[PDB]
């Protein structure tokens, strides 16, 4: 079969989301998705990807991934890579539909049928999560302090204030809840280290993106004082960035976002490499439903998948969703992703579509 | 003063080029430029930069550079960074116009009034260049071989064929010409090393982008066998990527493209850092006239600028150009860049413009 | 324009201070300043700088900095460098006056309009500072013990005595005050490490110059045990010394004194390099008013400036001073520094001046 | 005994030279010397050293060396260190006179009674030197090329021209002459490496100061390609700079100048440390007669002294000189240096003297 058209879809009600639909001459359409800079990525999909992939065999997934790597903008989570990643997800959806297999199977099998999930007044939230069988939560109480000083400094009183949610959670539920801390790369090295040390009494599970992930050797300074492993990083793209992270000797939980890192194609390889370092992987969500679903496929396959993040309107965008039951998530049934865009989407949302085909490229 | 409008300009006759014009409430308009993915970068300029910079003081150059660094797509030469870089160049143009000073002065002074240039049948070309006082030339005779095997392999007969231009140049002009070799990041490590060793007899000046610049630690393997210093890399963005390059201990000639690396703002800092390593800088051109001009300003200021690359239609795009005389290049006279878009541009070219202002963001 | 005369000024009432005035043929006079060895630096200014700079264009700042680097005495804070640094500050003052711009603007813009300051019975002092909105203080209670043994040893009773001010401050104001510790490079490695460990309970903010900064690799031993980041070092000169510091992997807060390190020219480059390491800069004062002012310009520009040290007679030396309001400091208004030597100086002080011109060199 | 007066002496006919005379209450006067910035160092001697040493016991040599180390300007060859070094040489002269022993004896004995020397149309010079029994010569034919480009670049034709003296020397005398190459720290890293490789055919003995000695880790890059050991460096001061050099793993011949590095006191310790690395020392001269003489004392004592550089008017400045016979140099006879300032100096030269005593400090 051959790719005939690239279709991009946006909704005015959710401006960060972009869907990429890959049509074929066999009537099999693949669905992909990415998040942030939707208009920019959309332009890229039609300007750059379309003339390179119209007429091509979509089953040559590894080759197509290689053919879209840019002279510029590689090893990053920039617009080009986000576009490439969304396209790659759609190719896996096509491959699944063509073989009548779930993506998890095509990755090498369901190593598990479901996986533990985590979600993002802290003590009441903690109680509520536990009762629903969820035993991990991620919070980011230092972001407000970071914005005040652009991450160069935190006063001890502001630090103490930001520790209060941890004390509240521990007072409420004790050791029953894993607490992950997200820093959103907002801090410079010294205050990051200061905050890390201060978190020691609270038995935190991981410290995610404690500094900007642009010179990874700096992470060794952080690992030397951090009471929790470094979680890094949804902001990194390609297996080459992850080689660099692993070679620091400071890597902990390996985080990636399949729509930001080069697709399921790069993600599956990053995961197998992380396993060689005896480290786990945790694919990023809380963006769109397709990324949640495709990430769940990866998490059911990868032997070193630790947890699959999930959201505590998705139902109006797509035909089916991953299901969460007693704190565990699994994929919707069926070939490929196990979902498509909802038929009623243009009546619930304000939809814009753009097409490329043989005539337009 | 305050930024009032962002204007982007493209020409159908040169699809890779994008101009960014920053208008102010004082009637001072700054001109910036970047290359590759013009439509994509244009979308980004209006989607991301405009709502962040309309109403802002353009003289806070370092702050504006900081404020545009993305959560994703940083430390790269991707679309976001290219947009940011073009914008940054325009800010320097404004700063120059507001102070009635050339950009080279605002960077810290004219450390030289002109700088040596280089240009990209090889023996006849060499003779011709020398007669015009140009004593360096850059060639890329291995690219065809790379495309054949996607850079995994080169046969000895193909290697021998690609060495012929070097033999021709040396036979014609002997030691009078520096020969730079560009590889365009097309090769994997092993054939790159094989080619490097084979170039030994030809006394090459630098070996530019011999492999992909995505895991820089691999450059140590190359430096161990290369008869010429590594030139790297116009494909790298931000001073953080250049910190990583310098820390390999394999850095040679530090190459950057001001419109791909974060602007004059990041470029000037990369250059001063390279000097701390006793290494030179060589700003990339042969793209558009504004990048050539702004690069020349940087090259006249930076004490460690080694050469300024130049082209052997520019005249119809802008009002003035850098001048080359006896193999040396200098800036056009005047404040800022010393150039603006040509008044007659819409009659020579097929021009498209897009605007953002307070009403549209 | 061209430099016509170099003028040096000293006052008998403040023997450590030296001013350098750079006169031009356009009547624009630049003011610079340095501290320590005033007579020696003055001799150097006339013996070495004058014959090299009379007749030169002062706007070629980077070039003039390069031209004054000595065959001997480089990469240091010695007399030659102090002279060069004072001269460099005067060049920036000229550049500002010629363009009608504050120095902070010429460095790349006001990234902030004001910056947090710190000042040097400890509990009462702490209370007083907080009420004036100052939330950081620097103390050096170990110096007396160091002098007793030339820094080779501290008895446990003497250590305990030197910890008392920290206990007093914490008892009085708790976590509301950052406490910086200065050691003035008075200690050898082992007692420095012993003292560092003993400071753990007091949550110190930084440990400044804990040992002599002459073999920087020794700092790794200190960083391995110190509960606070290393602050280093006002005693280091040139970006090359700071490259060496950064490459230890033990660098913390990057301290410099613009009049000891090579001027605003070297300082601005040291700051941008430190940012590549995700570290902050803190320019040294409590010397003379011109250094305080020029340092404040740097601190308003450098995105990674953390704090600007200040004094808790300046008013009789110069025409205007940086202003402190609610613990924040900013520059005086106007082009260049925004200050000149006070017209009434020869009536408040015992003034000595020396001149070099075309006739004397 | 106690120091009573410090006397400095300069001659208008040799502006780079400075003598320091240390008078005592026992009538024993010590003679020291340094080179470069004579007026500046003279000011320092009276401003800084005098008030610290008048009234002190000159025999406490190690203690006095320690007491003069500056808060600023240490680990350098700057004015303060040059002053300290000249003073230290005078202390050794006093110690010698007080004990009726040559300085070489006080250092630990005459390990040799004489040492090989070297001197600085090349082929005719080589012949002449050999006939006088001198079998090493140092040349610096690359300096003119360095000045042209401030050390950033050398054209192949200029490189070829600078190699001609080596070809001339080898054609004339073959392998009979060791050829040392001095670069005077004039080159950046890349051209330094290029020049080093090009010198391979000429069997050079050492490559001295191939780059600036300000970030010594860069020397590893040079050592990886140099066909001769690195000679470094007369520009470095204190044993701490030499620790840094040794720790690079690239050190070769250890060069120092006793009047630039901290005196015989630091020099003797640098030499013993270099021996621990199985490396030789070569004390710098061709400055003044006192430095030549004191260096020769060091060279006769230090078991790892390799050669003592010498000049091919000294006789009118001092009472006695080191003697060269058949390419070997030895000290003049007598206690201390074995020389004093010539009695007739004020009639051959234009002499200026300055004094400090108990009344003036
Ligand atoms: Cl590891
Ligand atoms: Cl290096
Ligand atoms: Cl570090
Ligand atoms: Cl060694």
- What phi and psi, each to the nearest 5 degrees, are found at residue C256? -150, 160
Residue A308's nearest CA partner among A120, A172, A149 is: A120
The CA distance from B35 to B288, in Å, is 7
Burial D93-122 (b: 16+ CB within 10 A, else e): bbbbbbeeebbbbbbeeeebebbbbbbeeb
D218 contact B CB<8A: yes
Handedness of CA A117, A121, A126, A128 (dihedral sign): negative
The CA distance from C32 to D115, in Å, is 50
Please count the helices (runs of H) and the strands (runs of E) in chain C.
15, 14
Interruptions in chain A after residues (C–N over 2.5 Å): 120, 312
Residues linked to residue A187 through DSSP beta bridges, in sequence order? A211
* Contact between residue B296 and residue B52 where contact means Cβ atoms under 8 Å apart: no
The residues, any chain, with a CB within 8 Å of residue C197's CB and separated by 6 or more, are: C225, C226, C227
Residues linked to residue D324 through DSSP beta bridges, in sequence order? D329
* Contact between residue B216 and residue B249 where contact means Cβ atoms under 8 Å apart: no
The CA distance from B331 to B113, in Å, is 9
* Contact between residue C329 and residue C136 where contact means Cβ atoms under 8 Å apart: no
> Which residues in chain C have Cβ-Cβ distances shorter than 8 Å to A218?
277-278
- Closest CB to B36: pick one of A72, A77, A238: A72
Helices C238-247 and C263-276, interaxial angle, to 10°? 20
* Contact between residue B33 and residue B89 where contact means Cβ atoms under 8 Å apart: yes
Q: What's the DSSP call for residue C46?
A: I
Q: What's the DSSP call for residue D331?
A: P
Ligand 1 center from residue A252 Cα (angstroms): 8
- Closest CB to C108: pick one of B62, B101, B272: B62
Residue B228's nearest CA partner among B254, B249, B200 is: B200
The CA distance from A206 to A196, in Å, is 10
Residue C176's nearest CA partner among C131, C238, C216, C115 is: C131
The CA distance from A211 to A187, in Å, is 5
Handedness of CA C321, C325, C330, C334 (dihedral sign): negative
Distance from CA of B287 to the nearest CA of D (A): 26
Per-residue 3-state assignment (H helix, E strand, C coil) for C191-251: HHHHHHHHCHHHCCCEEECCECCCCHHHHHHHHCCCCCCEEECCCCCHHHHHHHHHHCCCC
The CA distance from B138 to B146, in Å, is 17
Domains of chain A: 1-100+337-361 (3.30.390.10), 101-336 (3.20.20.120)
From the CA of A278, which ligand is nearest?
Answer: 1
From the CA of D248, which ligand is nearest?
Answer: 4
- What phi and psi, each to the nearest 5 degrees, are found at residue A230? -75, 130
Closest residue in chain C to residue A191, using alpha carbons only? C279
* Contact between residue D117 and residue D300 where contact means Cβ atoms under 8 Å apart: no
Element (H, E) at D6: strand D3-11
Q: Please state whether at least 3 CB pairs lie below 8 Å between chains A and C.
A: yes
Residue A208, SS3 per DSSP: strand
The residues, any chain, with a CB within 8 Å of residue A33's CB and separated by 6 or more, are: A17, A18, A19, A20, A86, A89, A259, A287, A288, A289, A290, A291, A294
Q: Check CB contact under 8 Å for C78 and D80.
A: yes
3-state helix, strand, coil in chain B (%, to 5): 40, 20, 40
Q: Check CB contact under 8 Å for C249 and A150.
A: no
Q: Please state whether at least 3 CB pairs lie below 8 Å between chains A and D.
A: no
The CA distance from D297 to D322, in Å, is 10
* D18 half-sphere exposure, CB direction, 13 A CA radius: 28
> Which residues in chain A have Cβ-Cβ distances shorter than 8 Å to C303?
150
> Which residues in chain D have Cβ-Cβ distances shorter than 8 Å to C262?
none
The CA distance from A168 to A297, in Å, is 35
In DSSP notation, A138-185 reads: EE-TTHHHHHHHTTS---HHHHHHHHHHHHHHHHHHGGGSEEEEE-TT
Ligand 4 center from residue C248 Cα (angstroms): 19
Angle at B353 between CA B349 and CA B359, to 5 degrees: 165
> Which residues in chain A have Cβ-Cβ distances shorter than 8 Å to C116?
153
Q: How far apart are the first and last CA of chain B?
A: 19
Q: What's the DSSP call for residue A254?
A: E
Residue B275's nearest CA partner among D286, C133, A111, D218 is: D218
C279 contact A CB<8A: yes
- What phi and psi, each to the nearest 5 degrees, are found at residue A17? -90, 140
- Closest CB to B63: pick one of C109, C275, C276: C109
Residue A165's nearest CA partner among A199, A191, A208, A117 is: A199
Residues with CB under 5 Å of ion ligand 2 are: B 249
The CA distance from A213 to A192, in Å, is 13
The CA distance from A189 to A301, in Å, is 35
The residues, any chain, with a CB within 8 Å of residue A142's CB and separated by 6 or more, are: A154, A162, A181, A183, A186, A187, A195
Angle at D340 between CA D336 and CA D346, to 5 degrees: 165
The CA distance from C329 to C300, in Å, is 9
Q: Check CB contact under 8 Å for D73 and C66.
A: no
Q: What is the Cα gyration radius of chain B?
A: 21
In DSSP notation, C284-305 reads: --SS-HHHHHHHHHHHHH-TTB
- What phi and psi, each to the nearest 5 degrees, are found at residue B24? -125, 165
Instruction: Give the count of Cβ contacts less than 8 A between chain A and B.
Output: 120
Q: Is B271 exposed, middle or buried (0-12, 13-18, 19+ CB in 10 A)?
A: buried
3-state helix, strand, coil in chain A (%, to 5): 40, 20, 40
* Contact between residue A66 and residue B102 where contact means Cβ atoms under 8 Å apart: no
The CA distance from B204 to B202, in Å, is 6
Ligand 2 center from residue D219 Cα (angstroms): 8
> Which residues in chain B have Cβ-Cβ distances shorter than 8 Å to C59?
105, 109-110
> Which residues in chain C have Cβ-Cβ distances shorter than 8 Å to D238?
214
Element (H, E) at B4: strand B3-11
- Hey, how many other C-beta atoms are within 10 angstroms of the C-beta on C110? 21
Alpha carbon separation from C358 to C23, C54, C91, D350 (Å, rounded):
12, 6, 19, 24
Ligand 4 center from residue D273 Cα (angstroms): 12
Kindly provide the resolution of this structure in angstroms, with one decimal.
Answer: 1.6
Angle at C119 between CA C113 and CA C122, to 5 degrees: 150
Q: Is the peptide bond before B233 cis (omega within 30 degrees of 0)?
A: yes
Q: Which chains touch D (3 or more CB pairs under 8 A)?
A: B, C
The CA distance from A136 to B302, in Å, is 53
In DSSP notation, D44-94 reads: HIIIIIHHHHTTS-TT-HHHHHHHT--SSS-SS-SHHHHHHHHHHHHHHHH
Instruction: Provide the residue count of chain C.
Output: 361
Cα D83–chain centre separation: 14
Element (H, E) at B271: helix B263-276
* A25 half-sphere exposure, CB direction, 13 A CA radius: 12
C203 contact A CB<8A: yes
Name residues 73-92 of chain A within 8 A of B (Cβ). 73-82
In DSSP notation, A93-139 reads: HHHHHHHT-BHHHHTT--S-S-EEEEB--HHHHHHHHHHTT--EEEE
Alpha carbon separation from D189 to B178, C239, D212, D327 (Å, rounded):
18, 16, 9, 35
* B295 half-sphere exposure, CB direction, 13 A CA radius: 31
Q: What's the DSSP call for residue C34?
A: E
Q: Check CB contact under 8 Å for C238 and D214.
A: yes
From the CA of D277, which ligand is nearest?
Answer: 4
Please count the helices (runs of H) and the strands (runs of E) in chain A.
15, 14
The residues, any chain, with a CB within 8 Å of residue A288's CB and separated by 6 or more, are: A14, A17, A19, A33, A35, A259, A314, A317
The CA distance from C246 to B160, in Å, is 45
Residues linked to residue C354 through DSSP beta bridges, in sequence order? C8
The CA distance from C84 to D164, in Å, is 39
Q: What is the Cα gyration radius of chain A?
A: 21
Q: Strands B328-330 and B115-118: what pairing?
A: antiparallel
Closest residue in chain A to residue B245, using alpha carbons only? A215
Torsion-angle region of residue D351: left (phi > 0), alpha (psi -120 to 50) or beta? beta
* Contact between residue C275 and residue B239 where contact means Cβ atoms under 8 Å apart: yes
* C320 half-sphere exposure, CB direction, 13 A CA radius: 16
Name residues 119-178 of chain B within 8 A of A (Cβ). 150
The CA distance from A56 to C246, in Å, is 50
* Contact between residue D122 and residue D139 where contact means Cβ atoms under 8 Å apart: yes
- Hey, how many other C-beta atoms are within 10 angstroms of the C-beta on C194? 15
Distance from CA of C106 to the nearest CA of B (A): 7
- Hey, how many other C-beta atoms are within 10 angstroms of the C-beta on C291? 25
- Hey, how many other C-beta atoms are within 10 angstroms of the C-beta on C8? 26
Q: Check CB contact under 8 Å for C212 and D74.
A: yes
Q: Is A315 exposed, middle or buried (0-12, 13-18, 19+ CB in 10 A)?
A: exposed
Handedness of CA A24, A29, A34, A38 (dihedral sign): positive
Alpha-carbon dihedral A337, A340, A342, A343, rounded to 10 degrees: -160
Q: What's the DSSP call for residue B78?
A: S
Residues with CB under 5 Å of ion ligand 3 are: C 249
Angle at A337 between CA A332 and CA A338, to 5 degrees: 40
């Amino acid at each position: 079969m051959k790719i005939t058209k690239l279709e991009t879809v946006r909704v005015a009600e959710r401006t960060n989301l972009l869907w990429v639909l890959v049509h074929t001459d066999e009537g099999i359409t693949g669905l992909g998705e990415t998040f942030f800079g939707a208009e920019t990525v959309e332009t890229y999909v039609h300007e750059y990807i379309a003339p390179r992939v119209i007429g091509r065999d979509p089953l040559q997934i590894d080759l197509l991934a290689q053919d879209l790597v840019g002279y510029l903008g590689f090893r990053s989570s920039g617009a080009e890579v986000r576009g490439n990643s969304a396209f790659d997800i759609a190719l896996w959806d096509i491959f699944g539909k063509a073989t009548n297999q779930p993506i998890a199977q095509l990755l090498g099998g369901f190593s598990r049928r479901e996986i533990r999930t985590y979600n993002t007044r802290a003590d009441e939230l903690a109680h509520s999560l536990l009762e629903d069988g969820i035993t991990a939560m991620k919070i980011w109480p230092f972001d407000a302090a970071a914005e005040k000083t652009r991450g160069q400094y935190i006063s001890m009183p502001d630090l103490k204030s930001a520790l209060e949610p941890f004390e509240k959670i521990r007072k409420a539920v004790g050791d029953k809840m894993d607490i992950m801390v997200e820093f959103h790369s907002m801090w410079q090295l010294l205050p990051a280290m200061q905050i890390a040390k201060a978190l020691t009494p609270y038995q935190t599970f991981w410290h995610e993106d404690p500094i900007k992930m642009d010179s990874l050797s700096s992470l060794t300074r952080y690992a030397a004082v951090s009471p929790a492993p470094i979680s890094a990083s949804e902001t990194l793209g390609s297996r080459w960035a992850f080689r660099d992270l692993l070679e620091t000797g400071a890597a902990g939980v390996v985080m990636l976002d399949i729509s930001w890192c080069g697709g399921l194609s790069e993600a599956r390889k990053i995961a197998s490499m992380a396993e060689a370092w005896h480290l786990p992987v945790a694919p990023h969500n809380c963006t769109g439903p397709v990324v949640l679903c495709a990430s769940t496929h990866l998490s059911l396959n990868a032997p070193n998948a630790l947890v699959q993040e999930s959201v505590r309107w998705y139902r109006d965008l797509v035909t089916a969703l991953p299901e969460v039951k007693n704190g565990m998530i699994t994929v919707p049934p069926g070939a490929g992703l196990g979902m498509e865009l909802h038929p009623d989407i243009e009546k619930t949302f304000t939809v814009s579509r753009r097409f490329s085909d043989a005539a337009s490229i």
